[PDB]
């Protein structure tokens, strides 16, 4: 990822953008009530608490793309990779304007809160002015289709999130690239029945947990491993990737039947962003919000695993490689144990920025006692231990539970905290509903006891 250009949107023909300067993040009911260090991004060059310059910070995720063509072992790595796709009898057909706006099976209906995009952002008009669940009519999207035509660029906004003091300080926001609502649609309908595919199969075939369900996926994941287990976590994943990676995922789009429309991977990878009154062009990196980026990097991701292996350890048996992974998460294993510290050598020659999984010091071996996938840990269920309980750590639930952005959305918030909360036992359960009713706000809403959940759970398999 790196940026060829920036520079006034107006000397192009492209309007300022607005963007709230004010974060929607206030303290909530239940702030003095738990323990948190976290506190709302930075959303402005202006922020008091900034020690260095708010651009630089936000930008300086793309890092370069250090590798320019394809070389062997990533094409060995497609091969593979796209052979396994291939026993899933993917649906190569295009996706008809409508399922593609208003869901099908494997896919959900577009979604009427992120951003329109350019330009509709610049004039005025909203998602649901377009779409409309209840007759489902191609026509006013259909219409403006052919009116302002694909491959329009992205307007990128700041997150606007929790994030630790130091990562406040240091400016390192996060940005959010939006697509207009043409691409977004566009990308659907070429490569929607991908996605149906993807979200309805996941595990080691599709080597992706995108459109998983954590509590009935995590006792289905052991058995899918192999002996040895290995991880690690990317830093600045998304921004690092190198045109050659974009490469890459259209090599195994074209082997399993969508050489058709790997044109889309081009804007992905080659990309037109507004962010304020600015305009720039970059070349790599996958864009936060496009349909299909968090596949589509699941995919590089298995790529990316795929060579490291076949370069550090000629001979390997990728058959045997058995990882599954959600964007830069990752959670892999082998039937003989490797280095993981090696393999993070080989990645920097990748572009890749690979460390200790956990933010760890050091490498360390990778056990069923100590891995993590998506913030959450591998526990087996005392009373059944053949049933795997997703074990998302209290400190981040405390985290999340001391702010908000809608008072209207505290009872929808903290019944979504309890659901990933029990899985920590029902001691630590009960400890967290008995804070929560500690105060007005708490007691007054409608959540689910102990046994309820766990019960719940049990017959859901
Ligand atoms: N709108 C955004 C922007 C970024 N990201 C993700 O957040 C990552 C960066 O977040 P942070 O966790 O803040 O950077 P890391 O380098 O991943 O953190 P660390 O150095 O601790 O590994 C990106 O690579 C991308 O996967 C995202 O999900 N949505
Ligand atoms: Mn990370
Ligand atoms: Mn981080
Ligand atoms: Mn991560
Ligand atoms: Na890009």
């Not at 899933?88 to 992120?114: R, V």
């Not at 999130?161 to 990562?167: A, D």
């Not at 999984?357 to 231990?385: C, G, H, I, M, Q």
């Amino acid at each position: 990822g790196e940026i060829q250009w920036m520079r006034p949107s107006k000397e192009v023909g492209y309007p300022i953008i607005n963007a709230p300067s004010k974060t929607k993040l206030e303290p909530s009911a239940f702030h003095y009530v738990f323990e948190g260090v976290k506190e709302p991004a930075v959303l402005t060059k202006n922020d008091p608490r900034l020690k260095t310059d708010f651009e630089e910070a936000i930008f300086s995720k793309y890092v370069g793309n250090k590798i320019t063509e394809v070389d062997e072992y990533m094409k060995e790595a497609v091969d593979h990779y796209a052979g396994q796709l291939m026993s899933l009898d993917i649906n190569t057909e295009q996706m008809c304007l409508e399922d593609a706006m208003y869901g099908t099976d494997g896919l959900e209906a577009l979604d009427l809160s992120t951003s329109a995009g350019y330009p509709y952002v610049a004039m005025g008009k909203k998602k649901r002015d377009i779409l409309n669940k209840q007759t489902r009519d191609t026509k006013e999207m259909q219409k403006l289709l052919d009116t302002y035509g694909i491959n329009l660029p992205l307007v990128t906004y700041v997150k606007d999130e929790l994030r630790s003091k130091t990562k406040v300080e240091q400016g390192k926001s996060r940005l959010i690239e939006a697509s207009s609502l043409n691409d977004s649609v566009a990308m659907r309908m070429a490569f929607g029945n991908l996605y149906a595919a993807f979200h309805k199969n996941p595990g080691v075939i599709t080597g992706s947990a995108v459109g998983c369900d954590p509590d009935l996926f995590w006792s289905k994941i052991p058995v899918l491993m192999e002996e040895k287990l290995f991880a690690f976590d990317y830093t600045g994943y998304d921004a690092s990737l190198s045109p050659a990676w974009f490469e890459a995922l259209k090599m195994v789009l074209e082997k399993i039947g969508f050489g058709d429309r790997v044109d889309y991977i081009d804007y992905l990878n080659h990309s037109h962003h507004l962010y304020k009154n600015k305009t720039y062009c970059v070349k790599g990196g996958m864009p936060s919000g496009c349909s299909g980026t968090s596949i589509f990097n699941s995919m590089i991701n298995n790529l990316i695993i795929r060579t490291l292996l076949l370069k550090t350890y000629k001979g390997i048996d990728l058959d045997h490689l058995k990882m599954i992974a959600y964007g830069d998460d990752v959670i892999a294993s082998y039937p003989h144990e490797v280095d993981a510290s090696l393999l993070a050598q080989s990645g920097k020659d990748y572009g890749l920025t690979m460390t200790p999984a956990d933010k760890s010091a050091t490498f360390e071996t990778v056990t069923w006692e100590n891995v993590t996938f998506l913030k959450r840990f591998f526990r087996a269920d005392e009373k059944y231990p053949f049933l795997i309980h997703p074990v998302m750590p209290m400190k981040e639930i405390h985290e999340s539970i001391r702010w908000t952005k809608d008072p209207r959305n505290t009872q929808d918030h903290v019944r979504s905290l309890c659901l990933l909360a029990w899985h920590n036992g029902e001691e630590e359960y009960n400890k967290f509903l008995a804070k929560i009713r500690s105060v007005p706000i708490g007691r007054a809403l409608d959540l689910p006891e102990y046994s309820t959940l766990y019960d719940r759970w049990l017959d859901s398999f």
